[PDB]
Write a structure and sequence with these properties.
part of a larger assembly, 7 chains, A alpha+beta, B mainly beta, F alpha+beta, B: mainly beta, 3-stranded antiparallel beta sheet, F: alpha+beta, Gyrase A, domain 2, RNA Polymerase Alpha Subunit, Chain A, domain 2, 3 domains, 4-stranded antiparallel beta sheet, 8 helices, 13 strands, about 25% helix, flat, DNA-directed RNA polymerase subunit beta (chain D), DNA-directed RNA polymerase subunit beta' (chain C), protein dimerization activity (chain G), DNA-directed RNA polymerase activity (chain G)
């Protein structure tokens, strides 16, 4: 139902829970890296520029 | 329409089927978002069956890549058009030019 | 790329511009001088630093 | 099963003999219906809307 | 011919003008180029990839 | 130990465009109020613009009226920019009617005491066959900023009117804003400054009206800025629902017959927490209920799992 | 029509002079407009009292040397800018630095006047070397709105009137349950000690309200 109550729950489960980001040809171990997720309005992934 | 163009855009729009190009030169009898009727000039008009050229327009419809392909009339009621004139724009064509 | 072009233009100097030659108490008031359009980003200046 | 059976008996749903296979709109995409076509076998009766 | 058509349009030959940051309202150092570029949206639209 | 500005000559030059000037400005406040006003002028200004539209014989944006040379998708996209101004009302449904081979302008609408069509030449569509004829119920609301069509279905709850084609809402009458502070010396003062705020309206806000309601917001925002009370919220809401939530849904959800649908409006029963507690006794004495009329209600309460007429010594709690 | 005014605002202050305030949820664009407009008033047009002119005892010019002090003349001018002055009923006061002997000349070593309040008597003005080393000068504090350099006087110390040592505003996204992009405005400010950051903003914002006394209803 996407009840608005759930959004506040999701932010709890998201906090200290890393996710893994991996881009096309995995060449060195830095091809997969773990980030802490920040919720975004939009359908694209936001990737820190230094990485 | 491209502000910065090359000149080819009219050739690509017309030669690609997407646009509706006048068969015979004449004057417009009726203009609908649906169809366009051309009352043929005498010179180009065949002797028998007389009559008018009637162009039925393609309206909102699915493409191979799920984009929409829709024709629109680019002339107004009772305007002179000659044979080989642009009668209706396809999608991503403006006024006879190719506007991607 | 974008980010380094940033710092370069910042920590770079030209021969003569706003703020030429003055002296400031510390970094804190060096920004104060710039943000208000009194000093140019790139002007030769003695400042107290620690 | 039992607990499903007991549940059907508490709330009285006539556990149907037919599955739900209907065509539904894919999650996230949203638009306006602009046309419906019906193709029917030769010799099967055209339903109402058809 | 471009510069000449810029004259008729009463626009600078540089192709560049000064701009102001809409947030802080202050000027942007250096002239920046502004102009019109025909641009396409290609059909790698996000809500198909996700 | 400070000064304060005010607005001298406001100089129109078109219905759409005018340079309003603000004379008593101190050193630098020019660019300070100047930028911080453009920000609140380009966004937060009130505006009315057409929200929904129903047209005679058309079912969706993507069709073709007979004898018109636009497509519904184009006529809608023409209305988005129809520039109206209304006064006491908040949502007003205008009506359009015209026949015959002829450009239907904005003037061809019908007037309401509050409707001012600030540009009556504005093309809406063209007819093209002698006795072709269109009619539509255009509905205009008034809000703030940009409410695009899509977000305008989550409130649903029966917006069913298939005819109503929703158009994207551009609720704002600012087109483009531009200040420039030229220096202006009142005869004696060291150096004060001017502020020419050149602006470009759609025609339906008179510059002074605007620039005032602009400064108003800045106040209410800065209102909380003055002191800073570290403020927070109570929070910790309630985690104890007594009854089953089903008793908090309206009686529509029961999917019942029309003669029985209005009848629970009558005898004062919206939520089913009241239909739940009204016996069969209560029901012959209610307007228009009988042998055929009440068998219907004991059957849609059975399927959802409730019964007619019981108690709950606590209805309904509690805020 | 009606607007959005913020809720939840936490001032977490580090030291009494410095403080960091977070304040959500602002309407779209309202973080930058309030942020930038308040930065300008905090920095540029903020009433303060700093040192403006210095006539020296021993030498007429700012490229000379005083016997007994290793800090150059241009050095002490900077120390003067870093003295925080606040006058009470008096609009202008001038102090005398009377101190001599082996050791640093702090700010508690200045004359204590009635309408004078030195916010840091610890502030180091200049050091004194061995033997005797004589120093007494007249240093004129002035009252003004802003930062006025020594260079702008045509007919001398840069005058740093305003209490603000540094200001920056950071605008970040804040969500309100079912609102997508709102602003969270983080103001960080450092002061010269003559007024605490919390109150500094109050009057800072009051100033901007006073200028709108012509349009609001």
């Amino acid at each position: 139902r996407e009840e608005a109550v759930v959004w506040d729950i999701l932010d709890e489960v998201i906090r200290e829970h890393p996710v893994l980001l991996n881009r096309a040809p995995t060449l060195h171990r830095l091809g997969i890296q773990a980030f802490e997720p920040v919720l975004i309005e939009g359908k694209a992934i936001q990737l820190h520029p230094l990485v | 329409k491209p502000l910065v163009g090359t000149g080819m855009e009219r050739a690509v729009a017309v030669d690609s089927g997407v646009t509706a190009v006048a068969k015979r030169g004449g004057v417009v009898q009726y203009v609908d978002a649906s169809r366009i009727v051309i009352k043929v000039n005498e010179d180009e008009m065949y002797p028998g069956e007389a009559g008018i050229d009637i162009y039925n327009l393609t309206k909102y419809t699915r493409s191979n890549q799920n984009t929409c392909i829709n024709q629109m009339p680019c002339v107004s009621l009772g305007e002179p058009v000659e044979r080989g004139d642009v009668l209706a724009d396809g999608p991503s064509t403006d006024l006879g030019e190719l506007a991607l | 790329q974008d980010v380094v072009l940033g710092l370069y233009y910042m920590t770079r100097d030209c021969v003569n511009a706003k703020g030429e030659g003055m002296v400031l108490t510390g970094p804190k008031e060096a920004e104060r001088l710039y943000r208000s359009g009194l000093a140019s980003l790139h002007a030769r200046v003695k400042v107290r630093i620690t | 099963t039992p607990e499903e059976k007991l549940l059907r008996a508490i709330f009285g749903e006539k556990a149907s003999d037919v599955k739900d296979s209907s065509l539904r709109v894919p999650n996230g995409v949203s638009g306006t219906v602009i046309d419906v076509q019906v193709f029917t076998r030769d010799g099967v009766e055209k339903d109402k809307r058809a | 011919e471009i510069k000449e058509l810029l004259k008729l349009g009463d626009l600078p030959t540089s192709g560049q003008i000064r701009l102001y940051d809409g947030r802080t309202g202050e000027q942007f150092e250096r002239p920046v180029t502004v102009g019109y570029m025909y641009m396409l949206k290609l059909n790698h639209l996000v809500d198909d990839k996700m | 130990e400070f000064l304060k500005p005010r607005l001298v000559d406001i100089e129109q030059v078109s219905s759409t465009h005018a340079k309003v000037t603000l004379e008593p400005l101190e050193r630098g406040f020019g660019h300070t109020l100047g930028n911080a006003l453009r920000r609140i002028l380009l966004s937060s200004m009130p505006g009315c613009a057409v929200t929904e539209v129903e047209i005679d014989g058309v079912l969706h944006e993507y069709s073709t009226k007979e004898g018109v040379q636009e497509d519904i998708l184009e006529i809608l996209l023409n209305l988005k920019g129809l520039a109206v101004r209304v006064q006491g009302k908040d949502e007003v449904i205008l009506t359009l009617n015209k026949s015959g081979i002829g450009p239907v302008t904005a003037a061809d609408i019908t007037h309401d005491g509050d409707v001012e069509i600030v540009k009556p030449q504005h093309v809406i569509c063209h007819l093209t066959d002698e006795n072709a004829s269109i009619s539509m119920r255009i509905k205009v609301q008034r809000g703030r900023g940009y409410v695009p069509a899509s977000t305008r279905i989550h409130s649903e709850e029966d917006e069913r009117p298939i005819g109503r084609l929703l158009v994207d809402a551009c609720y704002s009458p600012v087109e483009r804003i531009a200040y420039n502070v030229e220096a202006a010396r009142v005869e004696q003062r060291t150096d004060l400054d001017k502020l020419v705020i050149e602006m470009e309206t759609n025609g339906t806000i008179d510059p002074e009206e605007a620039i005032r309601r602009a400064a108003t917001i800045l106040a209410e925002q800065l209102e909380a800025f003055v002191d800073l009370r570290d403020v927070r919220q109570p929070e910790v809401k309630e985690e104890k629902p007594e009854f089953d939530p089903i008793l908090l849904r309206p009686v529509d959800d029961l999917e019942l017959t029309v003669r029985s649908a209005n009848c629970l409006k009558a005898e004062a029963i919206h939520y089913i927490g009241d239909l739940v507690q009204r016996t069969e006794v209560e029901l012959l004495k209610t307007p228009n209920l009988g042998k055929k009329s009440l068998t219907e209600i004991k059957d849609v309460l059975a399927s959802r799992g409730l019964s007619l007429g019981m108690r709950l010594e606590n209805w309904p709690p509690a805020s």
